[PDB]
Design an enzyme around this catalytic site. Structure first.
Site, PDB file in Angstrom:
ATOM      1  N   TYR A 101       0.823  -1.087  -0.247  1.00  0.00           N
ATOM      2  CA  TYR A 101       0.308   0.163  -0.286  1.00  0.00           C
ATOM      3  C   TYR A 101       0.481   1.465   0.292  1.00  0.00           C
ATOM      4  O   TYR A 101       0.440   2.315  -0.152  1.00  0.00           O
ATOM      5  CB  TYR A 101      -1.184  -0.199   0.374  1.00  0.00           C
ATOM      6  CG  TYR A 101      -2.214   1.269   1.319  1.00  0.00           C
ATOM      7  CD1 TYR A 101      -3.373   0.202   0.160  1.00  0.00           C
ATOM      8  CD2 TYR A 101      -1.698   2.468   1.365  1.00  0.00           C
ATOM      9  CE1 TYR A 101      -4.700   1.049   0.704  1.00  0.00           C
ATOM     10  CE2 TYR A 101      -2.953   3.438   1.591  1.00  0.00           C
ATOM     11  CZ  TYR A 101      -4.085   2.950   0.717  1.00  0.00           C
ATOM     12  OH  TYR A 101      -4.852   4.189   0.734  1.00  0.00           O
ATOM     13  N   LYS A 113      -1.962   5.061 -23.347  1.00  0.00           N
ATOM     14  CA  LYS A 113      -1.425   4.507 -24.662  1.00  0.00           C
ATOM     15  C   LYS A 113       0.199   4.782 -25.064  1.00  0.00           C
ATOM     16  O   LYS A 113       0.480   3.669 -25.570  1.00  0.00           O
ATOM     17  CB  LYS A 113      -1.812   7.326 -25.801  1.00  0.00           C
ATOM     18  CG  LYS A 113      -3.537   7.137 -26.034  1.00  0.00           C
ATOM     19  CD  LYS A 113      -3.772   7.118 -23.934  1.00  0.00           C
ATOM     20  CE  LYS A 113      -5.160   7.711 -24.269  1.00  0.00           C
ATOM     21  NZ  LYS A 113      -5.886   8.029 -23.322  1.00  0.00           N
ATOM     22  N   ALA A 165       0.218  12.125 -23.626  1.00  0.00           N
ATOM     23  CA  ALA A 165      -0.121  10.695 -24.153  1.00  0.00           C
ATOM     24  C   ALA A 165       0.499  10.169 -25.214  1.00  0.00           C
ATOM     25  O   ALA A 165       0.311   9.063 -24.557  1.00  0.00           O
ATOM     26  CB  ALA A 165      -1.936  10.979 -24.118  1.00  0.00           C
ATOM     27  N   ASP A 198       0.471  17.714 -21.779  1.00  0.00           N
ATOM     28  CA  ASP A 198      -0.371  16.435 -22.504  1.00  0.00           C
ATOM     29  C   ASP A 198       0.397  15.500 -23.178  1.00  0.00           C
ATOM     30  O   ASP A 198       0.141  15.586 -24.257  1.00  0.00           O
ATOM     31  CB  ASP A 198      -1.616  16.392 -22.752  1.00  0.00           C
ATOM     32  CG  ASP A 198      -2.996  15.907 -22.567  1.00  0.00           C
ATOM     33  OD1 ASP A 198      -2.517  15.094 -22.837  1.00  0.00           O
ATOM     34  OD2 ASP A 198      -3.875  16.411 -22.491  1.00  0.00           O
ATOM     35  N   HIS A 236     -21.200  12.407 -26.209  1.00  0.00           N
ATOM     36  CA  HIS A 236     -20.876  11.741 -27.401  1.00  0.00           C
ATOM     37  C   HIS A 236     -20.634   9.792 -26.642  1.00  0.00           C
ATOM     38  O   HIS A 236     -21.038   9.163 -27.456  1.00  0.00           O
ATOM     39  CB  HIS A 236     -20.010  11.753 -28.281  1.00  0.00           C
ATOM     40  CG  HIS A 236     -18.585  12.139 -26.961  1.00  0.00           C
ATOM     41  ND1 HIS A 236     -18.856  13.247 -26.071  1.00  0.00           N
ATOM     42  CD2 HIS A 236     -17.817  11.752 -26.762  1.00  0.00           C
ATOM     43  CE1 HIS A 236     -17.331  13.482 -25.890  1.00  0.00           C
ATOM     44  NE2 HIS A 236     -16.711  12.067 -26.114  1.00  0.00           N
ATOM     45  N   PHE A 246      -8.103  18.451 -25.565  1.00  0.00           N
ATOM     46  CA  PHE A 246      -9.321  17.111 -25.783  1.00  0.00           C
ATOM     47  C   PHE A 246      -9.857  17.004 -24.315  1.00  0.00           C
ATOM     48  O   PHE A 246     -10.358  17.733 -23.650  1.00  0.00           O
ATOM     49  CB  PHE A 246      -8.048  15.531 -25.843  1.00  0.00           C
ATOM     50  CG  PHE A 246      -8.798  15.246 -26.836  1.00  0.00           C
ATOM     51  CD1 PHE A 246      -9.479  14.771 -28.080  1.00  0.00           C
ATOM     52  CD2 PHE A 246      -8.819  13.490 -26.384  1.00  0.00           C
ATOM     53  CE1 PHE A 246     -10.017  13.406 -28.601  1.00  0.00           C
ATOM     54  CE2 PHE A 246      -9.673  12.506 -26.632  1.00  0.00           C
ATOM     55  CZ  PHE A 246      -9.616  12.743 -28.665  1.00  0.00           C
ATOM     56  N   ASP A 247     -11.441  16.192 -25.049  1.00  0.00           N
ATOM     57  CA  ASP A 247     -12.807  16.124 -24.593  1.00  0.00           C
ATOM     58  C   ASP A 247     -12.594  16.118 -23.113  1.00  0.00           C
ATOM     59  O   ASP A 247     -13.212  17.085 -22.254  1.00  0.00           O
ATOM     60  CB  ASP A 247     -13.573  15.045 -24.979  1.00  0.00           C
ATOM     61  CG  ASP A 247     -12.726  13.850 -24.840  1.00  0.00           C
ATOM     62  OD1 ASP A 247     -11.992  13.150 -24.378  1.00  0.00           O
ATOM     63  OD2 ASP A 247     -13.565  12.741 -25.203  1.00  0.00           O
TER      64      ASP A 247
HETATM   65  C1  LIG Z   1      -4.709  13.679 -25.116  1.00  0.00           C
HETATM   66  C2  LIG Z   1      -5.767  13.270 -23.952  1.00  0.00           C
HETATM   67  N1  LIG Z   1      -5.021  13.042 -22.846  1.00  0.00           N
HETATM   68  C3  LIG Z   1      -5.816  12.973 -22.109  1.00  0.00           C
HETATM   69  C4  LIG Z   1      -6.810  11.592 -22.043  1.00  0.00           C
HETATM   70  C5  LIG Z   1      -7.538  10.927 -21.250  1.00  0.00           C
HETATM   71  O1  LIG Z   1      -6.379  10.384 -20.946  1.00  0.00           O
HETATM   72  P1  LIG Z   1      -7.436   8.038 -20.352  1.00  0.00           P
HETATM   73  O2  LIG Z   1      -8.048   9.622 -19.314  1.00  0.00           O
HETATM   74  O3  LIG Z   1      -6.290   7.331 -19.599  1.00  0.00           O
HETATM   75  O4  LIG Z   1      -8.435   8.153 -20.902  1.00  0.00           O
HETATM   76  C6  LIG Z   1      -6.818  11.249 -23.450  1.00  0.00           C
HETATM   77  C7  LIG Z   1      -8.216  10.476 -23.437  1.00  0.00           C
HETATM   78  N2  LIG Z   1      -7.850  10.492 -24.964  1.00  0.00           N
HETATM   79  C8  LIG Z   1      -8.383   9.003 -25.309  1.00  0.00           C
HETATM   80  C9  LIG Z   1      -9.248   8.434 -24.625  1.00  0.00           C
HETATM   81  C10 LIG Z   1     -10.951   8.412 -24.138  1.00  0.00           C
HETATM   82  C11 LIG Z   1     -11.118   9.864 -23.892  1.00  0.00           C
HETATM   83  O5  LIG Z   1     -10.571  10.363 -22.618  1.00  0.00           O
HETATM   84  N3  LIG Z   1     -11.953  10.174 -25.118  1.00  0.00           N
HETATM   85  C12 LIG Z   1     -12.390  10.393 -25.824  1.00  0.00           C
HETATM   86  C13 LIG Z   1     -13.127  10.169 -26.846  1.00  0.00           C
HETATM   87  C14 LIG Z   1     -13.464   9.148 -27.749  1.00  0.00           C
HETATM   88  C15 LIG Z   1     -12.701   7.998 -27.307  1.00  0.00           C
HETATM   89  C16 LIG Z   1     -12.356   7.516 -26.759  1.00  0.00           C
HETATM   90  C17 LIG Z   1     -12.185   8.564 -25.765  1.00  0.00           C
HETATM   91  C18 LIG Z   1      -8.267   9.023 -26.818  1.00  0.00           C
HETATM   92  O6  LIG Z   1      -8.636   9.435 -27.437  1.00  0.00           O
HETATM   93  O7  LIG Z   1      -9.017   7.483 -27.435  1.00  0.00           O
HETATM   94  C19 LIG Z   1      -5.821  11.662 -24.411  1.00  0.00           C
HETATM   95  O8  LIG Z   1      -6.166  11.655 -25.304  1.00  0.00           O
HETATM   96  C1  LIG Z   2     -15.116   1.235   4.837  1.00  0.00           C
HETATM   97  C2  LIG Z   2     -14.172   1.870   3.397  1.00  0.00           C
HETATM   98  N1  LIG Z   2     -15.098   2.422   2.723  1.00  0.00           N
HETATM   99  C3  LIG Z   2     -14.382   2.781   1.585  1.00  0.00           C
HETATM  100  C4  LIG Z   2     -13.025   2.846   1.883  1.00  0.00           C
HETATM  101  C5  LIG Z   2     -11.901   3.757   0.274  1.00  0.00           C
HETATM  102  O1  LIG Z   2     -11.997   2.094  -0.860  1.00  0.00           O
HETATM  103  P1  LIG Z   2     -10.643   2.634  -1.200  1.00  0.00           P
HETATM  104  O2  LIG Z   2     -10.093   3.890  -2.151  1.00  0.00           O
HETATM  105  O3  LIG Z   2     -10.487   1.224  -1.971  1.00  0.00           O
HETATM  106  O4  LIG Z   2      -9.374   2.661  -0.316  1.00  0.00           O
HETATM  107  C6  LIG Z   2     -12.163   1.876   2.817  1.00  0.00           C
HETATM  108  C7  LIG Z   2     -11.066   2.200   3.079  1.00  0.00           C
HETATM  109  N2  LIG Z   2      -9.978   1.761   4.014  1.00  0.00           N
HETATM  110  C8  LIG Z   2      -9.082   1.540   4.157  1.00  0.00           C
HETATM  111  C9  LIG Z   2      -8.074   2.091   3.037  1.00  0.00           C
HETATM  112  C10 LIG Z   2      -7.161   3.198   3.235  1.00  0.00           C
HETATM  113  C11 LIG Z   2      -8.184   4.120   3.264  1.00  0.00           C
HETATM  114  O5  LIG Z   2      -9.199   4.597   2.154  1.00  0.00           O
HETATM  115  N3  LIG Z   2      -8.423   4.977   4.842  1.00  0.00           N
HETATM  116  C12 LIG Z   2      -6.425   4.378   5.087  1.00  0.00           C
HETATM  117  C13 LIG Z   2      -6.846   4.241   6.369  1.00  0.00           C
HETATM  118  C14 LIG Z   2      -5.289   4.022   6.780  1.00  0.00           C
HETATM  119  C15 LIG Z   2      -4.493   2.496   5.993  1.00  0.00           C
HETATM  120  C16 LIG Z   2      -5.519   2.724   4.660  1.00  0.00           C
HETATM  121  C17 LIG Z   2      -6.430   3.331   4.645  1.00  0.00           C
HETATM  122  C18 LIG Z   2      -8.210   0.397   5.613  1.00  0.00           C
HETATM  123  O6  LIG Z   2      -9.590  -0.045   5.868  1.00  0.00           O
HETATM  124  O7  LIG Z   2      -6.963   0.115   5.327  1.00  0.00           O
HETATM  125  C19 LIG Z   2     -13.053   1.698   3.836  1.00  0.00           C
HETATM  126  O8  LIG Z   2     -12.354   0.742   4.591  1.00  0.00           O
END
Ligand SMILES: Cc1ncc(COP(=O)(O)O)c(/C=[NH+]/[C-](C[C@H]2C(=O)Nc3ccccc32)C(=O)O)c1O
Ligand SMILES: Cc1ncc(COP(=O)(O)O)c(/C=[NH+]/[C-](C[C@H]2C(=O)Nc3ccccc32)C(=O)O)c1O
Ligand SMILES: Cc1ncc(COP(=O)(O)O)c(/C=[NH+]/[C-](C[C@H]2C(=O)Nc3ccccc32)C(=O)O)c1O
Ligand SMILES: Cc1ncc(COP(=O)(O)O)c(/C=[NH+]/[C-](C[C@H]2C(=O)Nc3ccccc32)C(=O)O)c1O
Ligand SMILES: [K+]
Ligand SMILES: [K+]
Ligand SMILES: [K+]
Ligand SMILES: [K+]
Lengths: 466, 466, 466, 466
Positions: D71, D265, D224, D222, D457, D131-132
């Site tokens: 963790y 990407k 990607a 950016d 979209h 981008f979007d």
């Molecule tokens: C330049 C840039 N910056 C950030 C990001 C976001 O990153 P992430 O969260 O990992 O997707 C992207 C991501 N692009 C995508 C993935 C996805 C999206 O986001 N819009 C969109 C529109 C149509 C189809 C699929 C997508 C892509 O072109 O297919 C990016 O192109």
């Molecule tokens: C009941 C409940 N709901 C939601 C979530 C969040 O989920 P997630 O985003 O996947 O972490 C948790 C998560 N608990 C944790 C994981 C993590 C955290 O979040 N605070 C915290 C504090 C100390 C050590 C580690 C952690 C855990 O018990 O160690 C949860 O206990």
């Protein structure tokens, strides 16, 4: 030349590189002018064999991870047993670590079984063509390996549908010359690897089996490439035009009493073999008693449980017609590209490789000097592609005379691993070989520097007859 | 009884299950009262063997994913070659699919090599003890397997440091009785599996080798459990108190000329074998010539490239003193729990398994009726734990007389896979066997329903003696 | 203390080591005296959390390999949708990358949904206890996090079946004080993580939901450890003595309108979250619109297809009673070992961790100086075991006040990953903490060197008060 | 059209099928005539995106198997930190679950930093093109996303070296129009996805950064598709003709102060994102404080340890020039085949996709009716290939005015996943689209049925205008 698109997409890749030309020359001299002795790091596209180099599917890998590695009674063993009953309708199985392990289980058992009642004093095996490992086990047990492929396989450029068929005339002649009491088994190789991966017709398998049933002769189906053989039967026999590949496979094995298969071919694996027996429990029992000291316990046979698991899945994928169409269609694409450029090949192309006829390509080298080997070394130094020889080199010497076995075909084999290379890789291979049309008349053969007595080509070190 | 904490944590699990009582009795009756013929689905905790059932590390799986599957010159073959030069200082390697494949390569070569110079007219092999697969290859090639373990291995309850040592007096006596010309090889089994996984001392290995060199006798180190032997040398020999495990291994293999290793044990694998030769290039060449038709090409030997990659990593992990301390301590913990309750065991416990002295446990069953097999079937029906017999059942019949080989010890082997079960699994096993105290005097031997001629205990079906 | 055997065996291992005392002292000073800023290499047994550190089965890794990585309409999405309908009878799902991502999708939607009618002028959330991440998103959206856990949760050493129950009286009092129009949602946390992983009874869940529907209040079930809660309901509620774990789960979610789940806990994953909605399609559409810019497209929700596939399998493995009996039994074993030595713990132990009451262990440290954090740093310097504090350090400051939130409990949490450590690892943990019984009165608190405003305990650097 | 051979071979495959015509028409009508709502089971070749659909190497999967799932302080986190220092020379990193998570971490932090002294009353972001999802996060925080791509990007058929360049004149004018105190950051998207994956020159990146540092404006890259941009710089800028890709990448990031990256990407992943900061420690600390509530702890940030391990290896393989040559050459091959058939595309083709200019294809439909989407639906119903629209549909409505933003280009994007499809798959795509040369006058247009307020979209169902 027609390209067939992959009925799959890529899920994991593996990097390949082209060694510099200086690296390839130094590597070949250190390898004794034998590509078998090259390291894989000195090879670009590896066409040495289609055995164990295949790319598996994600379902095969997932099956491996959940494989039961139990020493006795692995769950995957029973999945394998039910899979063989589904495809071949055979009731008994014995896993083996690969193909030559399967033959080492069955062939000696078949000899001792035939040697009961004091017969088979001069035992012989009869096949359309024993491959090098199959013929070696025949001779390692004191038998003669008789090959009776149809004569139409020796005419490389003339088309025929079944260049791997038995010569029915020669079969009855060998039975009359040696007697049925001396014929241990008939080995149906599908496809016929030595003839160029060429298929065997259904009516040929049926007639061979019916003749063997007349004389009480055991029939074993060398089943390394049985799916590719089944595809040709669907494609070239009008009787199986609307039949599934499995339906063709089910009919093929009505004409055999057992099978020895190298799962490293059509079942799309990296390791694995299999013995399956139709209904003879006595042969199955004796084969089990030999499997234990040689391969391992009778429910894994020298395989990890994960490899039996991958085999169960791969046996299903190997019969999928869309895959077989692309696989065989890719080999057809490489051959057509060479054939259209003037390179003589075994026509039509087989299921797993293109066979370049080096008799017509380099006629200035006698067969005893391995002309096909001189072409392979030239191709490697030119492009980094590694091929293998299927001619006088591989045939070895006759165990009786001790001299060169008569070779009718001198082949360079461009063996294609399954689902590994693209048709763009094929274009590289073809364009590299086509670029050597002006250098074929300059090549000279090889002479022995170190020769093993059995299966010499694998480790022999050659000397260029400069 | 002391528990040792795992020097690792769990990354992937596999479900196990306890079959019902009625399931176990019907499965045993179906299996001819031979646990080898049981399916894994009818076994809860499988103690049948420590071979191939081990759990691998994440590094071992990572090595497999990038394994070079090239037919010739695999990158992992050369890694396996450098690893053997590191661990054993040996210059030649030949991979094999497992242990019996390794002995099938080397042992016939050592016989033909001695025969070629007019020796080995009446050939024998000498060992502290040949295991069932090792002796089978000796007898298959027409030799006599002679076992000369120290008498202390038969005094099971009395502690001794080196219950696997050669009886040096019997060694010199067998050399004079047969002649050094008739001794094909001396096989040093480390650890001595038939004596209870008991170690061989460094001074014993040295004196055995020096005796062999006076007579020109070849020495092969059966190396399936060599790391567990090296730990015991560090733990009990004062000379190696402050030496690494690798330093003990390096000194061990100064007293052999070659090794035959089942990598399914100490190298923490599910499949794999190895032949390594110290410096005899002639023996290396002959062994390669036999490897090609029996196992595969000389750079993979019937193994997938991924399995050679896992072997290189497993060979390293198997030498880590922290792991060996936990592994052998877990076997010592199970043995202690049984010993605390009066169960006679081979004391001290070996490296890989607890051996229950069924000669002392069930006296009313003569050794000719396999008393340890009666205890195993009783333990399985009680708890679903599958164990294996090491006594008259495994020793089989002497090939010269066709009669029962004289068994000096009747052992039930509780064989522990590596990094698979917890000490809480050990508690279940101990509690299960301890719970059969009042039923030991009521057990009865077994008759043969079907006896194989070679390695009978694997597939023999039995009949409980009424 | 009672050891419970694993209902599985080990298939893959990962090496852990014990860093020296010297390495640990220089590491804690480097980490600002916060174990959260320690590298895992400086940690032996990691008890920081049970989130994302679990060990998966072979079926889970197999599901990952065949995972559909498609951007839209992944096959594993529909499998994940069908699984929620089976387990919870909910008609809509939205995957999320983990639990706090699932809360960031749903909670802002519930606030805006409540504000349509002009309601939620002074919005509040009501829960048995919001965990640090759940309350943070409540306060990020301008709401107050109200915790009304049963008073029996503060009675550390006194046994009670349901130390996670809602205080029904306080629930009705908070509804009347703030008004039902100002209560955005009720969050039922199963199990109650802040009370010590203690369970909520089915009748308490049934009563809270009946009160909520009486006032039209939306009920969200925080479901990170819902299976461990289901086990406790079968173990302690007589109505469910003969009911399956899935039947208990099915009844649990009759008393909720939606769920936010961190699949990194009971679904046995290393990553993954989930939003599931019972039938309110308007909330499902509003939550889908926020999922796209924050987590990802609505059919993968910022997860890889392989992780959704492992979730579908882990959701099934998390409900198996044999595994839950072992898992919770292992936590009970560690807690009993500490309790038998006089260490005050939240008795009985919860489902996922042992909570040491440091208000009773180290009375000389005021709550504002985090006494449990002093015990953790002491335990780490002694053994290399990393633990986490659940007291005034984690509780943080009141957003409206700007000063320390009052903490009724000062816990050190020994969090146990699922199927990762053995009971022998549990013995190492207990023995290390028991060895500190003489140094407890000498420990001093911690003060702030750098305090984050949002979630301080994760990245804060501390200074020991000298 | 020149085909470029793969600098790799296939190691694992997954099956793809061609649905029937009726299934595709049934699935498209059921999906609301939105390909985003199709199940992947009803898609043959998926060109919807190049994000997270890439094929990994064997090295990448091996890195996942040994991934540290701790963790806090995962070994893979420190590897990722050193990798960013090697590639970008940036000193701080924060892992994110994907790209839009990386933007949610950094963008609100940059807005509060810019508003620290009460300025940025009317905050704006300036980019060559947002981008979007990037613009959605700019507008979710109460800012305006200003796009100032070079006008030569709006001339589809006319070649230019750098169609992703900033319009420098419009950059300086925007700085004067809004004041530097309102410009929170400048976002250099490399490559420029909205302009057709077109590259940004090194001189353009340099001048934009110099103008920004003149006004004290933070510059975020950016990133990607930064490798594909680095390739074009080496290909088209003579200044970098003899430099490595890494040397081009190293120089690119002298012209930004931080980066947001979707590792799905160019780093060749299925999931993952990244924030890296050059040397601004205050912004790094503020970004960490927001990562914890939204994504996860600062050493994994919503990613499993195995995915950080895959990212360290993927960042290396994404910079390999041989791979980039084949990758970008494959997109060029698909574009050349279409351009040679009279089909207008954004020429030259970008790094990751062929952009089919549907404004020239279907001028009958106004941009407000999304003419490219009608072409996509026609292509899918004809071949099973799923593409995505990048025109007025993607651009959306003005978060101010609530009417559609002006679109200067109507593209149909044929997005190509990395190392997934062969050039034979491209021929299938090309021949399928070429086969529609007659039906372009028949196409119909689309009108909304359900429109989301943000990123319409993705989930919008639409009624065919016919
Ligand atoms: C330049 C840039 N910056 C950030 C990001 C976001 O990153 P992430 O969260 O990992 O997707 C992207 C991501 N692009 C995508 C993935 C996805 C999206 O986001 N819009 C969109 C529109 C149509 C189809 C699929 C997508 C892509 O072109 O297919 C990016 O192109
Ligand atoms: C009941 C409940 N709901 C939601 C979530 C969040 O989920 P997630 O985003 O996947 O972490 C948790 C998560 N608990 C944790 C994981 C993590 C955290 O979040 N605070 C915290 C504090 C100390 C050590 C580690 C952690 C855990 O018990 O160690 C949860 O206990
Ligand atoms: C019909 C038939 N039967 C049995 C077998 C043996 O099976 P196995 O032990 O698993 O290899 C084979 C195997 N063929 C091979 C593999 C290998 C071989 O044996 N000789 C040879 C010659 C040149 C290159 C590679 C090889 C192949 O064609 O490349 C076979 O073709
Ligand atoms: C010292 C030594 N040398 C060579 C070998 C052979 O290697 P391999 O082919 O890989 O099995 C072994 C193998 N021992 C075995 C494995 C196997 C066997 O052979 N007999 C037997 C009897 C009962 C159960 C399982 C077995 C074991 O102890 O369970 C060995 O112990
Ligand atoms: K292989
Ligand atoms: K195994
Ligand atoms: K994790
Ligand atoms: K994905």
């Amino acid at each position: 030349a027609k390209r067939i698109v992959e009925p799959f997409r890529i899920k994991m890749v593996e990097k390949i590189r082209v060694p510099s030309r200086e690296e390839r020359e130094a590597a070949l001299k250190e390898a004794g002018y034998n590509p078998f002795l090259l390291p894989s790091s000195a090879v670009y596209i590896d066409l040495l064999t289609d055995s164990g180099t295949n790319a598996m599917s994600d379902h095969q890998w997932a099956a491996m991870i959940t494989g039961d590695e139990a020493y006795a009674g692995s769950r995957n063993y029973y999945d394998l047993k039910d899979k063989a009953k589904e495809l071949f309708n055979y009731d008994y199985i014995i896993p083996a670590h690969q193909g030559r392990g399967a033959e080492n289980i069955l062939f000696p058992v078949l000899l001792k079984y035939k040697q009961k009642e004091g017969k088979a004093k001069n035992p012989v095996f009869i096949s359309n063509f024993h491959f090098d490992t199959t013929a070696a086990h025949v001779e390692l047990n004191g038998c003669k390996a008789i090959n009776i492929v149809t004569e139409k396989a020796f005419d490389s450029e003339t088309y025929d549908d079944w260049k791997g068929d038995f010569d029915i005339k020669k079969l009855k002649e060998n039975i009359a010359q040696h007697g049925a009491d001396n014929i241990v088994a008939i080995v149906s190789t599908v496809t016929c690897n030595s003839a160029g991966g060429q298929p065997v017709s259904m009516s040929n398998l049926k007639e061979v089996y019916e003749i063997a049933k007349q004389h009480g002769i055991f029939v074993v189906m060398d089943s390394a490439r049985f799916c590719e053989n089944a595809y040709f039967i669907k494609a070239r026999d009008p009787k199986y035009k609307n039949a599934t590949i499995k339906e063709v496979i089910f009919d093929m094995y009505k004409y055999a009493d057992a099978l020895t298969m190298s799962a490293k071919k059509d079942p799309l694996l990296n390791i694995g073999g299999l013995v399956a027996i139709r209904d003879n429990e006595e042969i199955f029992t004796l084969a089990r008693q030999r499997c234990v000291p040689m391969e391992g316990f009778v429910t894994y046979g020298g395989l990890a449980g994960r490899d039996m698991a991958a085999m169960v899945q791969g046996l299903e994928e190997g019969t999928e017609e869309e895959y077989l169409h692309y696989r065989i269609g890719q080999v057809k694409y490489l051959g057509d590209r060479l054939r259209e450029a003037g390179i003589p090949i075994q026509y039509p192309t087989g299921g797993h490789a293109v066979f370049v006829d080096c008799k017509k390509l380099v006629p200035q080298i006698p067969g005893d000097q391995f002309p096909a080997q001189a072409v392979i070394n030239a191709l490697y130094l030119e492009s980094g592609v590694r091929a293998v020889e299927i001619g006088s080199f591989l045939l070895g010497r006759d165990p009786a005379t001790g001299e060169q076995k008569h070779a009718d075909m001198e082949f360079m084999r461009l063996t294609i691993a399954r689902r590994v290379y693209t048709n763009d890789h094929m274009d590289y291979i073809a364009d590299a070989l086509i670029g050597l049309k002006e250098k074929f008349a300059t090549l000279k053969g090889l002479e022995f520097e170190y020769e093993p007595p059995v299966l010499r080509h694998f480790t022999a070190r050659l000397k260029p007859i400069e």
